[PDB]
Amino acid sequence: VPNPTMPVKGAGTTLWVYKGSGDPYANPLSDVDWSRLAKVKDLTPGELTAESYDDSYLDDEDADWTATGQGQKSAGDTSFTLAWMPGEQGQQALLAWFNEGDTRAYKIRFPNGTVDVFRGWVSSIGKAVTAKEVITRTVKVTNVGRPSMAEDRS
Amino acid sequence: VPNPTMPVKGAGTTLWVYKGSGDPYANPLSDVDWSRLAKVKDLTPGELTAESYDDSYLDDEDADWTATGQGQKSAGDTSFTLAWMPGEQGQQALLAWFNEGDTRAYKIRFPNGTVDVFRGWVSSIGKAVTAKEVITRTVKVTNVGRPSMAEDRS
Amino acid sequence: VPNPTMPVKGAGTTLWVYKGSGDPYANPLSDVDWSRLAKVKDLTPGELTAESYDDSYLDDEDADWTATGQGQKSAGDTSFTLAWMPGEQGQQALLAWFNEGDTRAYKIRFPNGTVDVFRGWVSSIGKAVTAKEVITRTVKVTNVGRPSMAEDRS
Amino acid sequence: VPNPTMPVKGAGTTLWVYKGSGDPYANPLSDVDWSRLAKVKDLTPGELTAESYDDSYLDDEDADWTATGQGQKSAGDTSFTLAWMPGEQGQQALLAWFNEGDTRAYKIRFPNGTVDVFRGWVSSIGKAVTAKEVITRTVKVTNVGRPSMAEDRS
Amino acid sequence: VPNPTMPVKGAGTTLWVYKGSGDPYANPLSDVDWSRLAKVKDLTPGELTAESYDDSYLDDEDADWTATGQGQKSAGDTSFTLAWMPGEQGQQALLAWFNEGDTRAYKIRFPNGTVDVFRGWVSSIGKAVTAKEVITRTVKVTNVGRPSMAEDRS
Amino acid sequence: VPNPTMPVKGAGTTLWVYKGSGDPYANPLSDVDWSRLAKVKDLTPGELTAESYDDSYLDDEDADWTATGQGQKSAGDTSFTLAWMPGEQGQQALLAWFNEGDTRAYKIRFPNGTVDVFRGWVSSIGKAVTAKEVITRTVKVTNVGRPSMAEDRS
Amino acid sequence: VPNPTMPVKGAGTTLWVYKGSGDPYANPLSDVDWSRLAKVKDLTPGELTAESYDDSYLDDEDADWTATGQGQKSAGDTSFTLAWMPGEQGQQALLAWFNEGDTRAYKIRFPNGTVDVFRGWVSSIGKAVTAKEVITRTVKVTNVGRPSMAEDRS
Amino acid sequence: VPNPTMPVKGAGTTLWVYKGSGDPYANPLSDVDWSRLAKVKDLTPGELTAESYDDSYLDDEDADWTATGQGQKSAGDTSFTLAWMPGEQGQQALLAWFNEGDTRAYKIRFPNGTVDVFRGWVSSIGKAVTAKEVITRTVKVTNVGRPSMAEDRS
Amino acid sequence: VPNPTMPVKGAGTTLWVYKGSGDPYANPLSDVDWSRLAKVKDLTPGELTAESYDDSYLDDEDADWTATGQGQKSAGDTSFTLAWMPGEQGQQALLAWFNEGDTRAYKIRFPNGTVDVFRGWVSSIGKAVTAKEVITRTVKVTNVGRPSMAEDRS
Amino acid sequence: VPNPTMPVKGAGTTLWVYKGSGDPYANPLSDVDWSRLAKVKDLTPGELTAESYDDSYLDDEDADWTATGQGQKSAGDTSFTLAWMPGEQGQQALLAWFNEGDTRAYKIRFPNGTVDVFRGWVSSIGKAVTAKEVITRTVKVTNVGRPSMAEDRS
Amino acid sequence: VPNPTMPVKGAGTTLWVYKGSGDPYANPLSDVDWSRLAKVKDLTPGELTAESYDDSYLDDEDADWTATGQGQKSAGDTSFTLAWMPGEQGQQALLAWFNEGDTRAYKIRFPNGTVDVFRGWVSSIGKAVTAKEVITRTVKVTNVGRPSMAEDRS
Amino acid sequence: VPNPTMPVKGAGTTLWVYKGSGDPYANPLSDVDWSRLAKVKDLTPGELTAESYDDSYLDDEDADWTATGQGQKSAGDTSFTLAWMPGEQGQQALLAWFNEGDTRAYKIRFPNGTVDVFRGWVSSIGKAVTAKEVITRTVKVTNVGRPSMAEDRS
């Protein structure tokens, strides 16, 4: 039985792409109108980050130690590699996404029972060919706006 | 039997270079008037990519999180290393391609049954000499314009 | 029995986050009004540092050797990785800390019997997903002001 | 029997330096008036390369994908390491070549039966001393002008 | 029996820090008024260095080969890592040294029988926490002025 | 019997420093008035090098391939590491050389039977301390002017 | 919550233009009858200034140091650049303003919660066209009379 | 689909020059009898401006603050640089325009779907010659009379 | 401890404006009846200067070299930029100072322990708005009469 | 093959000076009786220009917008820098041209296949001396009369 | 040992100001009755200059080339910046010098062993305040009459 | 071997000053009675130039294009910077030249093998002092009359 409180191993994660019209953040737990990408081999989700903003004046009584405040936050790049299946409707959606410069919403569903939703556009579409290994399609997606992390809902 | 839906191993890929007059994108599956480069030993196809365009104004109410949109897409470099056979027609075509700065169309044919076509010019011509190994000719080709990915056709 | 004089092994370290209103530096040994982050796997405490300030004049009789003085000190970044438990209260506190840009005080309690207090804001919130390993939450916290090292109290 | 069509292993390569007056490119297959460097232990021939020249205008109807053309070609550096024999005539010729800044023609004769001619000047002259290994002299030669690759003659 | 002429192994080196008023360079061999840092686990002493000053004119007959002269000498950084014992006097002296920027004199005493004295201020104070290893305190000290090498006294 | 024509292993090399007044290049083979540094563990002699000087005009009929000529040659840095013996004469000479910014001549005598002479000034004086290894003194010397390589004499 | 006492970052500023009949200075805080310019990318508000008026007589007892008084004050030029949207009612108002030489009142509304009102006429209407950037309309407005600065109201 | 309300990127702009007899302002959207200049590489359209007319009397009660009104409006200079093709019809038209001092009507057609018309005479004709770049023809045109901005038509 | 003899760093400077009736120069060390401007980011104090007065006659025996004497001294402009807080009393005092043309006395109190007093009137009041930076108020004040430099009191 | 219609790169330009008696404009394509300047390193051809002539009257019904007409055209200055070869005949011709104030015709022959003829007199003759660069002679030539641009002949 | 014939580096220069009654030029080498300014951080000595006097008549046969003769020589300005120490005697002397206009003699003493004397009056007194840098006092002094260069005495 | 026909690098130039009685232009190649300035670091020789003289009449049939003729030629300023050696004869000669307003002849001798002679008087004598650089003496000389350029002799 899935349990948010206890740790969970990573095997079982799925990746989804939104198609349709509506609010992706409204009800991420249901899968109606969410297309799926199958056979993902690697997945490194985006890394939220922030910039230091220098908060110092000449008036300040003491200047021995620095003082800074948080600046402009920004979600990073979410990159995954998945096996090459050009006839699947899923990968045709990826290249239609790339060619038509657009921002859609993609979802990560962990075995924990939680859901993680981002919005972004695709930045790279690569491939690797080796004699004795499956042909892989590597994708990197750049996020915009505010992600809806998993522990907002509780 | 080739099947686009299922994954495929990489062994069996071929590389072809176009000679003649016509439309390379019109009918890549046909093999007429396509010269072939033989005995490739490595192949890393080009990586499509795009650069971010900053979309922010002073008016916008929310400025905590960054907002960006897709910019100018560009295919990358395709580099392959193939055994040195200076008397073969294909490699003389390669150096004729390099000396006379020109853009031609080269094709990658996967065991999957699909076809991948690019257009570009050659950027590097190298060599490696070792006592106990076959002399290899390393080539890097820079693409221009819009590639024709294999999954456009379906 | 804990002993500040003798060396100590690292196992037993704990991490805490301050909640409430008061003076964090006043009495850190008490554990009231301090929330705790559980199941930390790695921890690298911040690195205090300073930058050189050039102290030279044309008058100086001797200029063969350089002469410098200490400049502006600054505590560094504290980064720890801890197992992903989105339903636990501590990690919801972490993301509330991140979303609302703010500076709080976090505490490190060593097995030695001493306490190390910092003040800072959170800079990065990341995650790593692998098939056969526990999903981890990686955090980096940037410090401001003057830390209260353990060596002050004695 | 040497065969340009089939692949060949690297053992048997020789290095030569032109002395005399004439046209090096006219007839490289002959071995008269070509001094030889003996006992070479590594050799990496130069890498021909070119740089991109941006070909874009504001008029262009389509600017989604980049468009570039080939720029200025340039042969690279040829570097080889050969055992230190200061009393041999070839290495005295090398240092006379270095001290008097000048461009000569050096030749690489592969076991394949073909010949590769370059023109250039010497850039580095180094040495390595180790207790249990032969003292080596390392050379790097920078090319100018147009090389005469082996694939021209056929 | 210690002997400067013959080589010596490194085990047995000690590190000392000066407290009091006087001339550190006057009599470093005496051990009075020199506090000691105990249980060091690594030590890389500073590296004296100098920067080139370009000495060339337009008049000079020969300009094929470069000509330079020595510039401004400067001792480097001395960094050592020692086990964390916050209750010991030496490490409280270290943090008092760091907080109040100041230049003091520290001494390295080799098993050879010689003494090495520097003057400088502290630049970094770090820590490393691991589950199965002793907690270590890493210090880096930046020197100023002229060091008193051991090779002066003889 | 030493032989310049044939290769030689590196063991047996010696390093010398000139003291006195005269011409170092006049008679390097004689060993009078040449002080010696003993017990050297590593030695990497300097690397002669040159700068490319761009030789191109707008008039030139062809500009497809680059054309360059040799620029300003310069001997590099000669660095060696030798065991720490502060009571020996040679190393006191090294520190007297470093403190008094000066250019002297140092000699390398190979087992081949040849001699290599440089002129230069010292740039670094470092040390390494390890628990179970001999204390080593590392020196780097920067050369000026024209070296007298070994195969000038024949 | 907006607070005049504390500093505020600049993001969120809006620009407005008055249409109708009434007193612009009477009630700037309400937005009835105030048209808005949207998507402003840069904004540098006007710089109030004054002229020195020479106050000196021959009678004056001392003339060693100058003495001056304030002259005729004048608000400067307020210039902003906003993205080109010729179909918006807002930008048509700008060009109707320019063609019909007139003085109207424009308003700046800061995130602080305050309001800044000027009166003036337009001096420049420019444009910038770049291949990969949004077309921008640059405007400069020259002010007349007395501005109603933000801290008049309190 | 072109849309005046939304912002547009600059790529796709065209420049046209009128030939024939009629009213340029009557129907600029139609493309008949408008010659075209091809391959523009830069374009900075003219900047409308006005000069202040001093409106102050001695009678006025208030003279602390300046008061001015708009004077004589005047379109500025329009300068574009386009690749040198002396055999094309457009550039021969340019030099015929320059030699015979005359005022014609030139049109700028944006990707937005709008049209901008000016009237003026040519002021400069320049050229730039570089070894590795396309020879460019730089033109500056001075406008007279009243321009017809694109947003008059709606 | 403050010390006029030794050099001092700039952090800790304060700016004050005189309100009330009395003699500003009489006792500036006291802080009563002096309003304060808070949060100053930059400060460039005025530059005392003088202009040359030509002292030459036709009689002078020697006229090869020029001869001049000092003319009329004049303090310059003091300009500081401070964060925009329109609800604070100090900045309302600044704009009341500007609107009513008047000369008051403002004071600079250095960390050294000394005081620098000027008298003057305000010349410029400006502002700068940026998306990611604090809104700043820039002021310039022009001095009259004789300043009371800190070096007078001792 | 040269083609006036298509763009061309600049490499291959030549500079010529007319000697003899005849009509320079009659047949510039021929190369007889035209001396040549060799080894030019930069060349910026003259910039044709004209000045505005104010065309306004008090009668004019409308005076809101300015109205001007073209004035007196004038070719600008042609400046080129070429390597210093005082023994060559061309540069002796240049200085004879300068010393005897006179107007001759100089020609620019582009790689395009066209010819550009001017007439003018020389204004500046300069030189630049640097230690590691070729001595250059810089010339500026001022044109008179009507140039014969390449676009006339077709 | 100081040596006028050989070049010297700048470090070690001192600046002195004369107090007392006598002849400054009589014996500048002696240091009695010369006050000293301490801790200078920059120094750019004055630049002697002269202005051309036009020497041409209508009679002269040759008027192609200009002819001029030297006019009125004049020493320039000497400006130095030195650390702000208002309690030191030298800087109180500086402001006493400024307030009471007066010409005194100041001396520059180079490490070369020579002495440079000027006479002049002070023109500017400035200051720079920065958060992390030493407060500096910038002075500019204008010379009168004839300087006594160091090259006179020999 | 020096060669006037071919280009030459700048290193090796010398600067000379004439002392004695005779004709400087008669035999510049001989080096007798020519004093020398040593250790010059920079040298920019004078720039010959001319003034436009307007040649236009009302009678002229055409006035569309300007017509001008050469006016009064004039050699410019020759400036060089050389290291400060006040005890050397040449620099005492420079200051004797400056103090006694006079015109002498100075010579530039290029590595090409040619000679360049000017006549003029000195205009500036400056100096630059830096902590870590050689003290430099900067001189600017203004020329009169007719220079004797290098390619007059052939």
Residue numbers in the entry:
A (entry chain G), B (entry chain L), C (entry chain H), D (entry chain K), E (entry chain I), F (entry chain J), ...: 3 to 156
Paper text:
The virion of the lambda phage comprises an icosahedral head and a long flexible tail. The tail, which comprises the tail tube and tail tip, connects with the head through the neck. The neck–tail complex comprises a channel formed by stacked 12-fold and hexameric rings and a 3-fold symmetrical tip.
Each of the 32 rings of gpV is assembled by 6 copies of the major tail protein gpV wrapped around an oligomer of the tape measure protein gpH. GpV has 2 distinctive domains: the N-terminal domain (gpVN, residues 3–156) and the C-terminal domain (gpVC, residues 157–246). The inner tube structure could be reconstructed to a resolution of 3.5 Å, which enabled us to build an atomic model of the gpVN domain (S1B). The gpVN domain comprises a β-sandwich flanked by an α-helix. The β-sandwich is inserted by an E-loop (residues 50–78) between β3 and β4 and by an O-loop (residues 24–38) between β1 and β2. The outer surface of the ring is formed by the α-helix and O-loop. The inner surface of the gpV ring mostly bears a negative charge, similar to the tail tubes of phages T5 and 80α, facilitating DNA transfer.
